[PDB]
Design a protein around this ligand. Sequence first.
Ligand SMILES: *[C@H](C)[C@H]1/C(=C/c2[nH]c(/C=C3N=C(/C=C4\NC(=O)C(CC)=C4C)C(C)=C\3CCC(=O)O)c(CCC(=O)O)c2C)NC(=O)[C@@H]1C
Ligand SMILES: *[C@H](C)[C@H]1/C(=C/c2[nH]c(/C=C3N=C(/C=C4\NC(=O)C(CC)=C4C)C(C)=C\3CCC(=O)O)c(CCC(=O)O)c2C)NC(=O)[C@@H]1C
Ligand SMILES: *[C@H](C)[C@H]1/C(=C/c2[nH]c(/C=C3N=C(/C=C4\NC(=O)C(CC)=C4C)C(C)=C\3CCC(=O)O)c(CCC(=O)O)c2C)NC(=O)[C@@H]1C
Ligand SMILES: *[C@H](C)[C@H]1/C(=C/c2[nH]c(/C=C3N=C(/C=C4\NC(=O)C(CC)=C4C)C(C)=C\3CCC(=O)O)c(CCC(=O)O)c2C)NC(=O)[C@@H]1C
Ligand SMILES: *[C@H](C)[C@H]1/C(=C/c2[nH]c(/C=C3N=C(/C=C4\NC(=O)C(CC)=C4C)C(C)=C\3CCC(=O)O)c(CCC(=O)O)c2C)NC(=O)[C@@H]1C
Ligand SMILES: *[C@H](C)[C@H]1/C(=C/c2[nH]c(/C=C3N=C(/C=C4\NC(=O)C(CC)=C4C)C(C)=C\3CCC(=O)O)c(CCC(=O)O)c2C)NC(=O)[C@@H]1C
Ligand SMILES: CC1=C(/C=C/C(C)=C/C=C/C(C)=C/C=C/C=C(C)/C=C/C=C(C)/C=C/C2=C(C)C(=O)CCC2(C)C)C(C)(C)CCC1=O
Lengths: 169, 641, 160, 160, 160, 57, 161, 161
Amino acid sequence: GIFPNTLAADVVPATIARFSQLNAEDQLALIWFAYLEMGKTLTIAAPGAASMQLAENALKEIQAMGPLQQTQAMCDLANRADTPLCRTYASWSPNIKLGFWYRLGELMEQGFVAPIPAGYQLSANANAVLATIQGLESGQQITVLRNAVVDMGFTAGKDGKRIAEPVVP
Amino acid sequence: SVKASGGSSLARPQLYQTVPVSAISQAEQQDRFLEGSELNELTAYFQSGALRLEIAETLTQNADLIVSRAANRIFTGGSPLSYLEPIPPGFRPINIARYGPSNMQKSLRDMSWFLRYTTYAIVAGDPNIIVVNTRGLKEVIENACSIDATIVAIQEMRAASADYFRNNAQAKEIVLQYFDILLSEFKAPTPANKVRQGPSNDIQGLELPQSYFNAAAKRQKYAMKPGLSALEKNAVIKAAYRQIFERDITKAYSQSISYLESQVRNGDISMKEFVRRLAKSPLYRKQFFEPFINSRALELAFRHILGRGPSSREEVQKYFSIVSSGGLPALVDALVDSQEYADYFGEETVPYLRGLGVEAQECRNWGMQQDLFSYSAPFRKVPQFITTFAQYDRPLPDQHVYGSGNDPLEIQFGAIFPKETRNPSKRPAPFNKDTKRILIHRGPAVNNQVGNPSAVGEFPGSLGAKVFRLNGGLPGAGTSVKFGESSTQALIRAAYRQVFGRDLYEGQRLSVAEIQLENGDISVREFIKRLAKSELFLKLYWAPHYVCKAIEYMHRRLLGRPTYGRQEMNQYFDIASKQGFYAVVEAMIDSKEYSDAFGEDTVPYERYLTPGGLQMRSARVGSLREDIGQRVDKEVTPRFV
Amino acid sequence: SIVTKSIVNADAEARYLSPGELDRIKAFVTGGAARLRIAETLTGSRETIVKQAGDRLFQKRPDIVSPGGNAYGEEMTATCLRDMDYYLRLVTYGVVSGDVTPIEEIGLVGVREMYRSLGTPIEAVAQSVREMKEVASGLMSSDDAAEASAYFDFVIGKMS
Amino acid sequence: SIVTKSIVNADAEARYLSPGELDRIKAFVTGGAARLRIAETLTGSRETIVKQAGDRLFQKRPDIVSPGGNAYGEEMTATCLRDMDYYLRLVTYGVVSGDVTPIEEIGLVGVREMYRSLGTPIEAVAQSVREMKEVASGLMSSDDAAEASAYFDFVIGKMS
Amino acid sequence: SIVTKSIVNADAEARYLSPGELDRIKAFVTGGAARLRIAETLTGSRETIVKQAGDRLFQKRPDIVSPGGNAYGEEMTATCLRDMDYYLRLVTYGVVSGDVTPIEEIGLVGVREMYRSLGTPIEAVAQSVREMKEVASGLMSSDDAAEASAYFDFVIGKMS
Amino acid sequence: QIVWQNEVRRFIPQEKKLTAGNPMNFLGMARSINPAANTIPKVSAQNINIEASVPRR
Amino acid sequence: MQDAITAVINSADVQGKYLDGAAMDKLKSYFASGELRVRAASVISANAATIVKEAVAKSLLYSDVTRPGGNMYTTRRYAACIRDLDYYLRYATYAMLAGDASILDERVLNGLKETYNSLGVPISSTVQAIQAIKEVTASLVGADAGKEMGVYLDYICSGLS
Amino acid sequence: MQDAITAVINSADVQGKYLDGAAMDKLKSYFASGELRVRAASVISANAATIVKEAVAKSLLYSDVTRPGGNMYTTRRYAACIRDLDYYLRYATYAMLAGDASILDERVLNGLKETYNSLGVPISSTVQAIQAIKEVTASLVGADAGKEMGVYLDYICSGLS
Ligand SMILES: *[C@H](C)[C@H]1/C(=C/c2[nH]c(/C=C3N=C(/C=C4\NC(=O)C(CC)=C4C)C(C)=C\3CCC(=O)O)c(CCC(=O)O)c2C)NC(=O)[C@@H]1C
Ligand SMILES: *[C@H](C)[C@H]1/C(=C/c2[nH]c(/C=C3N=C(/C=C4\NC(=O)C(CC)=C4C)C(C)=C\3CCC(=O)O)c(CCC(=O)O)c2C)NC(=O)[C@@H]1C
Ligand SMILES: *[C@H](C)[C@H]1/C(=C/c2[nH]c(/C=C3N=C(/C=C4\NC(=O)C(CC)=C4C)C(C)=C\3CCC(=O)O)c(CCC(=O)O)c2C)NC(=O)[C@@H]1C
Ligand SMILES: *[C@H](C)[C@H]1/C(=C/c2[nH]c(/C=C3N=C(/C=C4\NC(=O)C(CC)=C4C)C(C)=C\3CCC(=O)O)c(CCC(=O)O)c2C)NC(=O)[C@@H]1C
Ligand SMILES: *[C@H](C)[C@H]1/C(=C/c2[nH]c(/C=C3N=C(/C=C4\NC(=O)C(CC)=C4C)C(C)=C\3CCC(=O)O)c(CCC(=O)O)c2C)NC(=O)[C@@H]1C
Ligand SMILES: *[C@H](C)[C@H]1/C(=C/c2[nH]c(/C=C3N=C(/C=C4\NC(=O)C(CC)=C4C)C(C)=C\3CCC(=O)O)c(CCC(=O)O)c2C)NC(=O)[C@@H]1C
Ligand SMILES: CC1=C(/C=C/C(C)=C/C=C/C(C)=C/C=C/C=C(C)/C=C/C=C(C)/C=C/C2=C(C)C(=O)CCC2(C)C)C(C)(C)CCC1=O
């Protein structure tokens, strides 16, 4: 969608690259904790500025599947895995993807979606990247988050990855 | 009348040769800059120019006296100069009274004309004009003019003209040489005409007067022989490439087939075999076979191998059959092995474009061969010889009176015309002032106004387009939720879609006209007139087009039909000449047919189509009905079931 | 340019150019050094003009650079400045040609369609052009300023 | 590609493809994973190949980048490396296609005329392709290296 | 064969075999074992194939062997089955060569003219070739039968 | 002095170069401006009285 | 002409970029469909005359076009129509093998409509005959390769319209 | 022309006999050597210009033929000579790939001796240049492939003799 800032040797591209260094577990936990940090230290969400109807059906499905299936769907999104929902997610614009993650976090906070494992604590590198992002301005923060979540889901042609985050049984 | 035209482009045969034309054409036919030879000829000619103009000046000043001396030596018994517009044994002076006034006038005119063309030849630096117009004049005038008398007159003129040039052997020698050429050429008998016999029974035989050939630019002829120097062989091979590929692709792109060139320059293969193998090559295949349908490819091949375009319907038929059967190799073999090829080029001569001036030309493929010989021939993809030849044998096509390019696509919006220069596709046809184009009604066929002129305005129902009418009352003719706001606005937007094809962008709508219509102050006709005359319509649909294209598109939008022919087209075009765009719009919307078809409350709509437009719409796979153009078999369950 | 608009008008009525049209073209012609001076001044300081105008705009309209605003984010702000640069270049073309046709045909016809599709508040686009006009006028003399301000005003009106 | 080559050959003879041509297409279609793998290797190491080859070339033929040479200057050297990158891209096209036709049609028809007009020595461009071939072969297995070297040497032979 | 066709194509353009052409040649020549096996199968069992094909043909088109037919009589039948055996030999040649050039230039260029001279129905001869194809396929493995089917189909189509 | 090693090390793919109109060309300018986002505005539609607060001009 | 491989290469070359993941996916798809394309082409070549025969018997025989005054009347015109159908089948097979309709525009459609108009050849009847060819070929070649052949036959039909 | 395979086919078809054990053995022998032939052809194509350059350096330059009065004197004639040499190399590569000398006997050796005699091309020096080409190719491609190429280069030289 909107042009992504990938490699420019500046704080925003640098932080984006760092977020891309993190593992799937680190990245997913980082965005969860960033969501918890939204509104106090990070920028708030403005979902009215995104055509979120495109995600509506997908979100409904996530709110219908069982808690284990919900957690697996989020893990699939973070794992660049090939599933119908991952492809649907990838087809969206950056704003829609980011608002979709926001609604997932809202549902988890409300319980409608499987919450984080109890007593989970962010790792070292992920916490450092999150602190960096907290140190940036609101515009820089929204750019960094947009570029963080834009590459999630499945897109054909590209491939790779070896670590994966299956479940928390 | 004739039913088709091959097109007509300006033809410029050379009337006579001049030194600069000779040199520059010598360089240009070989696709090169002028070299030391031609430049030196130009230098010498320009240096001699001052003297030549001196000769011309002195002869034009004293032309009266020279002609008078001639007329006095030749005629006896009166004064030949009463009206101005070495000795052969048979010479005898001619009597003015006996010989007659008309013939005396022609005698004096001819003497003066000889002197005038002699001065022309002096200035041009070449006697070609004299030779051209004097070889065979004798036989033209033997029976009413004495040849001995003319010879004596020319000798007297030669002597008198040279008498003014005691300067030195520079002016005198030139004058004497040109007059000697004139004398020997007037004494010449008429040479036989050059006959171009028909190669088959479908092509006519022709002949050309030798004077016509002498005037025209001579075609340089390249023949490969074993004894030629290496540079000459190089020139011959370059000529072969220029002929077959239409330009020197070796110079341009280093494209070449080296072994073929070695074989032909060794004499292993003849120039004919070299042409055969080059035209079969993947280079030729990629450049002049792959980009074209077979119908156009064979026309280009005729250009490249025979130096001419197809001559008849039968020929294109035969060779299209040949290429359908055996493809490019069969086509090339048939052309190269034809008796015609060997008759012209034989084994050694590189093929050359024949065309005007080289031999007698046919009328039937005149324009098509003019187009074919242009260097832009590769960019015409539509066949021109099969199309034109077929159209000769058939009535006038479905086509605008001024040509196919004047027919826009019958699409919802946009004025899309074929561009004359882009992928040339022009198909001229002779429509006289009275033809009427057959149009297909969008509706019940029997409502076509040709057969049912009182059907005009009969709405077409389900068989035709939707029709928007201000039938309901207008609002405010206070209270909210007045239902008369949706219909009037739907009609306004329909009128915009009709005049412009599609809705305008925000800020473009003529809001004043819309409120003045919604307030009952004007009629629907007046509003569409305002739309048609709007600067937006001018910029979109009038300004960017040929005048008659603009008029035709206008007519289709406003009257819902193409123009019938030259009567409507001519009246609107004449108004365009005299008054301009607004007056043309006025004429269309104030015409009687507009009133009949559309009142003061009906938005115009598509009422008719050309056959081409209907075929575009209804011949696609998803729209083509099952019963159209094929046998519909009734399916019945087998009797054994 | 002006020549093309006058030609179109004169041809639409199947007439040669009138004395008035001819004198108008002549005035645009001979007094054509000032137009090129104005264009050169606008082209020389495009960086500063667009940067200062964008700063002024974000000060006046921080909402467009706040959550939910079109220009929110580094990339969105960059594209906004790019749009302002487009409009400054078009203004220079209009100044040079003595007509508003090139501006109209490059960046105003259907501009409302484009910005409605993009979600961009068009009135803020007109405001950004206002800031660019103010800065450019500060960067030029009085008569040059008036001449440029006329075309800036044309653009602003077409988005207001 | 063999598909277009055979289709053109058959079309010029107004015939369907022979069974031998169809079997050739079948074999070419089956053996495509290796070609795509060689192409993926080459495109992955693009900038490295270009930079190493350019370094080797300018070391070997300093006159090209010394005073009076065609590649002398910051912009000229950049352009020369740009040409090297062009020809690497074409070599990858040829590898993927399994045929030299894309290379020939994009960057060898009339190449002598172009570089003669520009003043570039063509044999030095051939040397540049040789250096690129060596660098590329260094990063591949022997079979893959030979397969890519086929197209590299096609370019080298046509450019010298 | 495919080798001769590739060499002719390369010579028509005055060049060496391209890398793609060499790869096709290598693939063809590595697969020579399968072609030789298919040819051996056809050769060793020629009599069974011809006999069964002729029997099925005569049963399918008795008019050919009926009185008045071209094949009527003992000697005419012997000649007809000799022709069928000849075409089996051609099919084996084509299978080994990789293309249909030997079949084309031995027994298929001008077949219509010869059989029209002899009065034989070309339809019936093509039907006989079809019967030979069916028997040979049933006598051979699926992949091998499919491989031979291409050449049998070429013979049938150009003989119809 | 001109050193070709510096240019070789500085090679950039041609297709990756920015051309006219690319909004990337205004990335540096956008960073320099650093537009100030508004503070999170605290609004509660529940506590607004529409009838009283709406202007009665 | 362009095939699918050359099509993707040229789409990459006009932008001056190397073949990325999506282009490689397109090439893989074409290499995966090549076996079916070759088999269908062999089948069509084996039965080309039969395909045209049956299509003509299905659409044009015993109708207006073959009777005196119809465009297929006289043996010359009948043969010409037959070999036009032969052209269309051969070029549709070419395009199916290449997975690209470029050859059809280049060596079939460019100027064919104008030629037919000049000759008075009925275009709707030609389209119906080509549709009959599509149906016969599909019944001979299979559903999927039949659909692929139908794509290019319909391309010819649309070009004629 | 004939390659090995078509040569076997012709030899059998002359006698109207199927492919027997001997013909099968010859075909297998050719099929086995195909990989080496193709690799040798690839190498020869890679270094054709270099091979010709080294051959002329060894055999022709600084001789009589290059000086005024020699037949390799002018640039036109030098270019013609280099063209003859690379023609010989390319057609020898063709013959080696086909495993048969027929292609040489027709598309190279057809009046060539008569041509050289008529034009005054010295046959001895041409033979020496071809021998230099043979030596260079053998050193550059290997021993077995070297003698495989040498068979056909000797065929050309004998055709000129
Ligand atoms: C080089 C080792 C020696 C040499 C060569 C030389 N040859 C010619 C001229 C010709 N050579 C050929 C040969 C061929 N042409 C072909 O197409 C092929 C078949 C593939 C072959 C083998 C021919 C036909 C000619 C005559 C036409 C032509 O020039 O192409 C020359 C030029 C002779 C001249 O008098 O101009 C030369 C110099 N000469 C030597 O001295 C070397 C020993
Ligand atoms: C958008 C995805 C792509 C694009 C589009 C584009 N189109 C035009 C201009 C026209 N479009 C049409 C189309 C139609 N007319 C019809 O009747 C129908 C069916 C209802 C269609 C689809 C026409 C006729 C025009 C010309 C007339 C007009 O524009 O009103 C343009 C503008 C071209 C110009 O300058 O004239 C553009 C930009 N361009 C892209 O780059 C996209 C891939
Ligand atoms: C009757 C013997 C055959 C027949 C006729 C048929 N015609 C149409 C439709 C039209 N006919 C015409 C013809 C003309 N219009 C003219 O102005 C002139 C010149 C004087 C002629 C000859 C036109 C133009 C049409 C189109 C509709 C219209 O009238 O505007 C049809 C209807 C076709 C349809 O699909 O609706 C028919 C049936 N059909 C036969 O089968 C007979 C052999
Ligand atoms: C009778 C001696 C033989 C025979 C005849 C037969 N013919 C057909 C079908 C057609 N015949 C023609 C012929 C012509 N059309 C022309 O324009 C000309 C020139 C005036 C000729 C000679 C055509 C076009 C057809 C097609 C049908 C149609 O007219 O629409 C058949 C039918 C075949 C079938 O299967 O439908 C037959 C039986 N058949 C024999 O066996 C005799 C030797
Ligand atoms: C058959 C389904 C329909 C039909 C056909 C028909 N066509 C012709 C004549 C010609 N057709 C062509 C076609 C082409 N030219 C090309 O370059 C290509 C592209 C590969 C094609 C397909 C041409 C050139 C001709 C003219 C040949 C000639 O010069 O005679 C005819 C005969 C027309 C005539 O007057 O002889 C016919 C009958 N007609 C139908 O009714 C069917 C629907
Ligand atoms: C000097 C400015 C450049 C240069 C020259 C150079 N040339 C050679 C070798 C040869 N040069 C020729 C050229 C001709 N011979 C002719 O008869 C004519 C036509 C009038 C010309 C132009 C030839 C044929 C040779 C081959 C040697 C031979 O006589 O047989 C060399 C030697 C190269 C080697 O490595 O052996 C050199 C050095 N070299 C430069 O760098 C200058 C640009
Ligand atoms: C302002 C504005 C907006 C911006 C909106 C913004 C900024 C939106 C940003 C929203 C953010 C930061 C969303 C992040 C959500 C993260 C979730 C749901 C992750 C949960 C993780 C889980 C379940 C992981 C569990 C786990 C599992 C099971 C394991 O395997 C083990 C551990 C682990 C924890 C990894 C819009 C874009 C809307 C519009 C435009 C606009 O201007």
